[PDB]
RNA sequence: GUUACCCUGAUCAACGGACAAAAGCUACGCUAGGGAUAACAGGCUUAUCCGCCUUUAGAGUUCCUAUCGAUGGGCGGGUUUGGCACCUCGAUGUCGGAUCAUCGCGUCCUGUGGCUGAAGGAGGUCGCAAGGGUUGGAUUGUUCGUCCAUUAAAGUGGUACGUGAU
RNA sequence: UAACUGUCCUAAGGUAGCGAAAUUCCUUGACUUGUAAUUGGCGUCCUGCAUGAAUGGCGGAACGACUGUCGGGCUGUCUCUAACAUGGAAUCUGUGAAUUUGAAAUCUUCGUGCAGAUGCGAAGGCGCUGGCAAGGGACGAAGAGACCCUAUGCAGCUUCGCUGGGUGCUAAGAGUUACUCUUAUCCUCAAGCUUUUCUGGGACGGAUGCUUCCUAAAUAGUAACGGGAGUGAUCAAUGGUACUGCUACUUAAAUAGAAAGCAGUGCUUGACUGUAAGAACCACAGUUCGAGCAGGGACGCAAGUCGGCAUUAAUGACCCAGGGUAACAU
RNA sequence: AUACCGGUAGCGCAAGCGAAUGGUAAUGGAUCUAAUACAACACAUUCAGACAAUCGGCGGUAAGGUCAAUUGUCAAGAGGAGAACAGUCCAGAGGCGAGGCUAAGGUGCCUAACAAUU
RNA sequence: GACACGUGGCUAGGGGUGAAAGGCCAAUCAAGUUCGGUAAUAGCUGGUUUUCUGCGAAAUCUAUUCAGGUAAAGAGUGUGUACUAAGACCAU
RNA sequence: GGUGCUCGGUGAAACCGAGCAUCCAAUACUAAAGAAACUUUACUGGCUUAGUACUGGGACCCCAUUUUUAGUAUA
């Protein structure tokens, strides 16, 4: 959920809206059951962290975990007080861009039962709506 | 600059009439006086130019 | 600054001599026929012609050659070098006259100044007096 | 036939070849070639 | 190309064409000598 | 000496290069303008703030929901600190209390209903309700704050953080 | 705690006697008293942001329309105001202004709006006109300067800002032969001139040429104290030309490169003289490419290349001053 | 009887593919041109812009914030609709008329117009 | 008494006077008042007076002791010249 | 009769004398690269209350047609 490269470097655009309903990346590739997004919005970290454990306390031991999103754009804030212009404020946050086709969150062989279980407390942490896909 | 020690220098006709042409030169890694074969107008032929400040 | 590097002239433009017709960084089009190329890499037409822009195989990969292919009411009337030199000679002669009709007379074209002759070597065209011995 | 509130609209203040500070006029050379004389003298055509 | 001043290209291509059209007109009749487009009659309109 | 040609010489770096040279102060200041540039505040926003939740892992001698909320996700206000400079410089009382007010409720009391780990008392929340009540003064220029001791209580805000043509 | 020793730049590191003090950020400094309750005093203590023998340190009698605090008495300052007296005000008669004023026949609330509406929209209200009172509004009135910014702005003042002999002393000559003249110049006095700009106010900080990459949206072009690399050169060979071996580098990035890469060789100076049609570009000044012609040359059997280096940065006008040469002049 | 130029959106693990609008030239227009093009002919003004939609940087995917690109309006533009309304939608006002047809918007009453389809 | 008062006199503006306050020097003094240079200067503010008709912008860009000023280019008007175009659209 | 790998031959050229792979005179699989075609959809032009108001163009990848190869097999 953070940046793990050596320069603390610079984004411009923070958006992902574009559409892959095509087969191009909507099918499970490492897992089973999937948690997928429906509408883009960009997400932070802790969001990332705060589901990934909510989901995870669902979760044996014997179900992998597989994710998706790591946390690698650089977000700049800038502090309190200070005028507007004079530069681009320090690195706050990282964030992901999140596309409305994208699954976000694919399970091994856990029953199809928890995994909408554990769907409903990832998309109660989440801001965007969550779906449910399958390997079929 | 001023840790450059490449100045301009002239390089005055052996023929005579005074022509000369400015070129630029190293003096550390040139020591010696430079002597080239060019043309000469007053002339119209090849003759040698020496270096002179 | 702006550096405006781009093709001027495009395929089947017809072109004279001295028209660049394409000003590059480096050569991604290479000269061909009737063609020079300058420092720069910029391609420059030395013949009465329509440019050509055609690939052909190349050392590393699928080369695009500029050229300019001479018009064929010329080398009609055209040894051969001789006869093209002088066609295009009347062709370029041609042009300033046609130009110089367009333009009616607005622009500042020519000295004719009060003074002796404006300097003149014995090649003549000096805008540069030179006292002689 | 002024505009608004410039300095052409106070009236002879500015000179008509002032042209902001770069000093155009003043970026060519000088010459002091006299010419030669006979340009004093009456040029008289054969034709004529 | 940001110098928003009016090309004189269309002048130059104008000039190389009408330049280069009595060397066409020679050699093409040279050559038929040595050796496009249908119109209907102009009505004035099509609704009776 | 005059004139051309061939040439050279600034971190002329404020790099289209002020007339030779070249620093400050003005709560003593003066003039012309600017709401084209800020402060006293009205307008826009809601990052920070404040309420409402939701998820609620847990704490609670056991037990998520008597009671508290850890992490994420939001909705509403502009009364906090900020951001913009849209409004007035042909100058316009705010950062206090003295008197006198009006309104909202997110109720401190009085009037009241539910859950109560509810012995009635005494409490914790939660639901309705804004009729009228919220006093002393010792200390600080303090609207901040205590702590003297009394009440049923010593409410929080909109009021150009009400109120100098009183 | 650091009394005595150990160190570093350094004119020197502040004594008996001072200190939360006219002056000490923490602050409601811990300590006693003071009040029932004390952040403002008094007397101690130390942790001196930013004290201290000539900016004079240590306290005292008397003095003060000076400043901060405690007791007694005193009383409407107050709890909490009441009655009365005099003179305005209110009534009548007589005399008799001014500030202000686009025109007005000027309602309320909510909304809108150059962003707080008497005038606009929706809804509602209102017999009409006054006297005597109160002042919430009319961004009441009264000053085209309260504060901030700007000017080819002024003014006065200050100084190790600049330039001057003007001014005072000084220096060196000279005259009548102390005084006077000439010339120069430290330190004083009096002046005269300067003392930019961009800036989500101003100040502070930062920057002011040129090149490349992203923004920049597939010709070109395209902004923000928007974001990442360079540069103010090197090289008589790293230039030119003709060759010889080998193959993943050449560099600031991009485009490119079987050589424009890496090692070599043989000769040479085109790292020239005088020009140049035509175009790229472009406000202008400038900037960029340039085939070809003439001269004299270089390399190559030739073909043909060479007006510096694969390119895009290393290129400051004009004036002024200096040098070589040429012509004319004295 | 059409040809070159571009490396973006999208896609790919990468190398690389690669649009749509676009530029330029030729050819053809009895399509337009009460005007256009040029001018070393002369006289100016302007060089403080604002907002809406579509795509963006910096901002908080805040601000009638500030700065880019395309288009429009206002500026310099009345009329009708949006209750009122610089910048939205329709529409570009020579004047008069107690004539008619429409756009945006309407068709219970204020407020013109069908219990049309009902 | 370092006192107050009266009557004449002296010190005048880059100057006087001051038990020293930027105090006073005839109700605007860190430079009195009046007159002259002077119709100073003001890239700033305000204003510009009869009618009708036709056309009709710009707030971009470059430079600037310069960004509220100016000049050049772009966009306006009149005049001239010249094309079925150095023009606009559409098709291939 | 074809291209190369080089021995040499001159004129700097290019071809000549050799001697192997196919060009012709093969089928059958596999892994690469290209070519043209195309369903769907991204993506876009106009219009737009932001797409049960529309409409034009149209990819990439996969599958399928096929070419240049290389490798592994056949009698
Ligand atoms: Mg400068
Ligand atoms: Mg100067
Ligand atoms: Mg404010
Ligand atoms: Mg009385
Ligand atoms: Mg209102
Ligand atoms: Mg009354
Ligand atoms: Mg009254
Ligand atoms: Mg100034
Ligand atoms: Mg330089
Ligand atoms: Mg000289
Ligand atoms: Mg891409
Ligand atoms: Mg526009
Ligand atoms: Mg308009
Ligand atoms: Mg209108
Ligand atoms: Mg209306
Ligand atoms: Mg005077
Ligand atoms: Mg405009
Ligand atoms: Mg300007």
Redesign the interface.
């Given at each position: 959920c953070q940046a793990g490269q050596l320069s603390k470097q610079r984004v411009f655009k923070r958006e992902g809206i574009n559409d892959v309903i095509m087969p191009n990346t909507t099918q499970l590739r490492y897992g089973t059951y999937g948690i997928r997004a429906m509408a883009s919005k960009r997400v932070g970290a802790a969001t990332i962290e705060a589901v990934r454990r909510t989901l995870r306390r669902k979760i044996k031991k014997t179900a992998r975990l597989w994710i998706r999103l790591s946390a690698v754009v650089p977000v700049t804030r800038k502090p309190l007080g200070i005028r507007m212009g004079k530069g681009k404020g320090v690195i706050d946050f990282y964030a992901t861009p999140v596309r409305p086709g994208q699954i976000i969150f694919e399970m091994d062989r856990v029953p199809r039962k928890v995994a909408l279980q554990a769907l409903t407390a990832a998309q109660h942490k989440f801001p965007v709506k969550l779906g449910f896909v399958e390997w079929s | 600059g001023k840790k450059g020690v490449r100045l301009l220098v002239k390089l005055v006709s052996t023929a005579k009439t005074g022509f000369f042409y400015v070129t630029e030169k190293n003096p550390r890694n040139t020591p010696w006086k430079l002597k080239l074969m060019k043309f000469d107008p007053k002339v119209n032929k090849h003759v040698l130019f020496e270096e002179q400040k | 600054x702006x550096x405006x590097x781009x093709m001027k002239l495009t395929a089947g433009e017809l072109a004279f001599p001295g028209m660049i017709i394409l000003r590059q960084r480096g050569t991604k089009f290479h000269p061909g026929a009737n063609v020079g190329i300058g420092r720069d890499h910029t391609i420059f037409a030395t013949g009465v012609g329509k440019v050509r822009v055609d690939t052909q195989p190349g050392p590393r990969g699928e080369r695009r050659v500029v050229s300019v292919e001479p018009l064929p009411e010329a080398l009609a009337a055209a040894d051969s070098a001789l006869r093209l030199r002088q066609v295009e000679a009347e062709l370029v002669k041609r042009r300033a006259e046609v130009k110089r009709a367009m333009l009616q007379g607005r622009t500042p074209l020519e000295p004719a100044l009060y003074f002796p002759l404006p300097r003149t070597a014995d090649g003549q065209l000096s805008w540069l007096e030179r006292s002689v011995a | 036939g002024r505009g608004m509130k410039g300095q052409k609209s106070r009236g002879r203040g500015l000179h008509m070849l002032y042209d902001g500070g770069q000093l155009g006029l003043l970026k060519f050379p000088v010459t002091r070639?006299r010419?030669?004389y006979?340009?004093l003298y009456y040029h008289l055509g054969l034709s004529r | 190309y940001k110098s928003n001043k009016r090309s004189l290209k269309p002048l130059n291509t104008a000039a190389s064409w009408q330049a280069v059209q009595p060397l066409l007109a020679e050699q093409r009749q040279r050559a038929a000598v040595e050796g496009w487009r249908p119109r209907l009659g102009p009505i004035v309109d099509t609704c009776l």
């Open positions: - | - | - | 070639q010419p030669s006979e340009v | -």
